[PDB]
Amino acid sequence: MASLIYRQLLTNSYTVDLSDEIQEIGSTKSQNVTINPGPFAQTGYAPVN
């Protein structure tokens, strides 16, 4: 029935995962960002003459 067809449309969700992993595997590159420090020391070279 139309309402039953609507519930059927709700049921078959086990294909969206297949679809988007298909999208991902044929998609562009992956990447891995790296780590960075915080504050610093503000040093120099005093005894120069």
């Binding site: 891995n32 790296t34 780590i35 960075n36």
Partner: protein, 48 residues
């Protein structure tokens, strides 16, 4: 004192020979070195 010459009482090394039939000269010591190094930045690495 040199011999058969007029100069006497040498104070220092002439240019004749310090080899003296020996092998080397040995000096001992220890450095105390402070300098700048870039090779200890242990954060810029990929995840996991």
């Amino acid at each position: 004192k040199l011999t058969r010459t007029r100069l006497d009482r040498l104070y220092g090394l002439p240019a004749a020979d310090p080899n003296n039939g020996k092998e080397y000269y040995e000096i001992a010591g220890r450095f105390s070195l402070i300098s700048l190094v870039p090779s200890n930045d242990d954060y810029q690495t990929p995840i996991a």
